[PDB]
């Protein structure tokens, strides 16, 4: 069964590495199981404060620097947000281009997350040195598609490289890893550790391609520069040769996703089947993404091809519409002035007030977003559940493949395992749609290259931009007064997932998901990392 110690007492992990930004996790463990948790974000920058009084056109350039991992997504949300506030409807080509850049961002972001941020919680790199390369080539012939990168010679080469590295005594990013010396919670055979390590190195190259693709439309990566109020500026992105390259690089990236990412995820999933019973939560929210009609937030919600919705208490039979007026943020357990609870983002207040480390009454720089009193998990798993409940064809098919391959029930997805698997599920779906989306923009662009609509700055207005970013439901909310920013609030997926307790004392998703975590070895609490990482935390996103 699942390794578990008898440990009783506190554990603090700070820093949580292999996330974006600065997170401290505190838990109380009892008989080797986490019984309480706190998600403590450790950095404040204050973009909302900074934006006050500025040109609304400037908002996207400031907010995109909320985060460089989920680069673009903030500039998109801001641009949606201001387009709404000025009541401009962007041209079809701009909808297409904006959505394709989001797709490219998913591909890049998710590949890097699985391999470079998450996989070291499940793969013991050093144990790959124990593997036989022939035995690993054979095993790879049986967990994934044939490919030259998986041949014995290729796997020996990775092994030799890794061996010379480890024997140098300069372990670098592997220094003091939780798997050094063996670890009870690490289950893979050395043959699988070799394969995953091989792909880890391959992924470091492949992400450069994924970014290149994105930069064809986005201008550069990180931090795109192609969006403007009323649409996009990139006329050249509607043209043949740049699109042909965009398609070609996107096919190489998608080949890697299907050849390596998904089989790697599924193998890990089969070995760590027990994690289908750890780390689940109950409520899921998505604003949807990839809409065919982005003329308004209402149209976005309704026509997102990855649908929007609300699931509560794991009830897949009642997917509710999103009520954008029902969202608010608490600050009772956050480092902000009293008086800030229960604020709809249009009425949002960011008044920073630090107390001290591990003050149980105020222990995070994130606000606590709630939905009618309830915490909501956001991200791939939420999107997946909502899409599956609504019989979205592509989600149905691919979820079913997974459950059929893993031989587990759909209920098994409410877990850290499912959270991990959902990420890959939706990557394979975006991949399946790239050629269709590309061909729709190439044809459209060729027929008429309109890319930005005329608009007017109002003296007074308000507006909201919605996106489902790689980590979930993102909204930006503006109040314009005197043709300037009167208030601008970000509510970000990581705020939903990793914020602190709300005004009622109620745990956030990550804090609830940590309840019941087994700790095999309190000195090396990899299980905390597995769950935290499965949420794909971004603290710079979270706090802004």
């Amino acid at each position: 069964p699942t390794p578990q110690s008898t440990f009783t007492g506190p554990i603090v992990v700070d820093p949580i590495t292999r996330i974006e930004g600065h997170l401290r996790i505190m838990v109380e463990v009892e008989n080797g199981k986490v019984k309480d948790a706190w998600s403590s974000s450790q950095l404040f920058r204050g973009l909302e404060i900074i934006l006050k009084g500025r040109d609304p056109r400037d908002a996207q350039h400031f907010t995109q620097r909320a985060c460089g991992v989920c680069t673009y997504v903030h500039a998109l949300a801001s641009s949606r947000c201001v387009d709404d506030a000025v009541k401009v409807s962007i041209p079809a080509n701009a909808r297409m281009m904006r959505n394709l850049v989001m797709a490219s961002q998913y591909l890049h972001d998710h590949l890097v997350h699985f391999y470079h941020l998450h996989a070291l919680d499940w793969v013991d790199v050093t144990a790959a040195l124990k593997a036989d390369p022939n035995k690993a080539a054979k095993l790879a012939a049986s967990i994934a598609p044939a490919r030259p990168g998986n041949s014995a010679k290729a796997l020996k080469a990775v092994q030799d490289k890794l061996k010379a590295f480890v024997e140098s005594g300069q372990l670098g990013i592997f220094t003091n890893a939780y798997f050094l010396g063996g670890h009870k919670a690490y289950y893979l055979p050395p043959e699988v550790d070799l394969i995953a390590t091989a792909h880890y190195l391959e992924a470091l190259h492949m992400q450069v391609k994924a970014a290149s693709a994105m930069a064809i439309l986005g201008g550069k990566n990180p931090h795109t520069q192609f969006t403007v109020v009323g649409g996009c500026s990139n006329y050249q992105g509607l043209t043949k040769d740049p699109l042909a390259n965009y398609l070609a690089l996107s096919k190489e990236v998608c080949q890697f996703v299907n050849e390596c990412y998904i089989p790697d995820l599924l193998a890990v999933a089969g070995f760590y089947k027990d994690w289908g019973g750890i780390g689940g939560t109950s409520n899921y929210l998505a604003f949807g993404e990839f809409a065919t009609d982005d003329s308004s937030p209402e149209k976005h919600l309704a026509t997102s091809q990855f649908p929007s919705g609300v699931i509560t208490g794991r009830d897949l039979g009642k997917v509710d519409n999103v009520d954008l007026g029902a969202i608010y943020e608490d600050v009772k357990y956050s480092w902000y002035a009293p008086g800030g609870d229960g604020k709809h983002p249009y009425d949002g207040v960011t008044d920073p007030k630090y107390t001290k480390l591990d003050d149980k009454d105020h222990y995070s720089w994130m606000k606590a977003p709630r939905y009618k009193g309830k915490a909501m998990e956001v991200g791939p798993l939420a999107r997946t559940f909502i899409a599956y409940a609504k019989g979205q064809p592509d989600f149905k098919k691919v979820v079913d493949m997974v459950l059929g391959k893993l031989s587990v029930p759909a209920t098994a997805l409410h877990s850290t395992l499912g959270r991990t698997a959902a990420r890959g599920i939706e990557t394979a779906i975006v991949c399946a749609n790239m050629e269709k989306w590309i061909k729709e923009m190439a044809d459209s662009g060729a027929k008429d290259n309109t890319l930005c609509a005329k608009w007017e700055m109002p003296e007074e207005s308000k507006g909201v931009g919605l996106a489902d970013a790689p980590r979930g439901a993102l909204s930006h909310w503006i109040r314009i007064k005197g043709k300037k920013i009167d208030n601008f609030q970000l509510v970000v997926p990581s705020t939903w997932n990793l914020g602190p307790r709300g005004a009622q004392g109620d745990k956030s998703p990550v804090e609830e998901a940590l309840i019941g975590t087994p700790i095999a070895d309190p000195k090396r609490p990899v299980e905390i990392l597995r769950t935290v990482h499965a949420f794909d935390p971004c603290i710079a996103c979270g706090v802004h």
Partner: protein, 262 residues
């Protein structure tokens, strides 16, 4: 086994865009860099250890007998004794100051670490500062938001194999920051001809006219963007958008409004 120079990488008030940028390097790729060229001994985004294990790994690097180079990503928040930016329970300013004391060299990756960056923009609630300001020591600045990896990796390799490259008044290596964006821009002919796009929807825009009247800060921004491109494919002006001046100190405040020249 040939020894590889230790590099310690710290993350302060940052967005991780500079880490993300660095791993876009292709000459060489990041794996070859860290397997063959440097010993990357602490890097929060990708390192295997977490918590006390990670802190220990930092401590080991800072006490390595061969010394180490320091890369800093992010500005330093200084309000309330530095406590608005903490790692492992310590103010970011205190750890950076500690790491800098014995560094062979300090490279600031990005406008944030170089100059203070986005968190320092008015009204600067965290009282963020650049590294050179906060520590009182000279730094090698590789600004941009983020900088091109060609620039950062080239600096790193230059520092480890040749010495400190020549730096301008703002601490930037002249090899990459010696020229104005505008001087190498393909639109320059339009600019000399006063052929400006009045708006993004205009026929002028569609024809690739100069983006000056739309706020382009190319004319006053030192960077190599049009010469080397980003991601081997593009740069902002080629994508039809004005330069924000993102490699200039305090550009958040000196180059805004972004869509104007006023």
């Amino acid at each position: 086994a040939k020894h590889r120079p230790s590099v310690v990488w710290l993350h302060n008030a940052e967005c991780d865009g500079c880490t993300e940028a660095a791993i876009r390097t292709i000459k060489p790729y990041i794996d070859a860099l860290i397997l063959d060229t440097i010993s990357l001994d602490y890097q929060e985004t990708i390192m295997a250890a977490a918590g006390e294990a990670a802190e220990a790994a930092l401590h080991q690097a800072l006490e390595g007998k061969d010394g180490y180079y320091l890369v800093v990503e992010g500005g330093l928040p200084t309000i309330d004794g530095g406590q608005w930016g903490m790692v492992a329970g310590h103010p970011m300013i205190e750890t950076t100051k500690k790491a800098a004391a014995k560094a062979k060299g300090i490279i600031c990756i990005g406008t944030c670490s170089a100059y203070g960056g986005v968190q320092k923009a008015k009204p600067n609630p965290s009282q963020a500062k650049g590294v050179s300001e906060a520590l009182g020591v000279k730094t090698i600045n590789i600004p941009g938001c983020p900088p091109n990896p060609i620039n950062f990796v080239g600096a790193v390799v230059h520092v480890l194999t040749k010495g400190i490259p020549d730096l301008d008044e703002n601490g930037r290596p002249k090899l990459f920051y010696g020229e104005l964006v505008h001087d190498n821009c393909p639109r320059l002919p339009h600019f000399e001809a006063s052929e400006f796009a009045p708006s993004f929807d205009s026929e002028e825009a569609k024809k690739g006219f100069c983006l000056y009247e739309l706020g382009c800060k190319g004319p006053v921004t030192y960077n190599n963007c049009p010469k080397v491109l980003f991601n081997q494919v593009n740069w902002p002006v080629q994508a039809g958008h004005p330069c924000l001046g993102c490699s200039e100190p305090d550009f958040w405040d000196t180059m805004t409004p972004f869509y104007e020249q006023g």
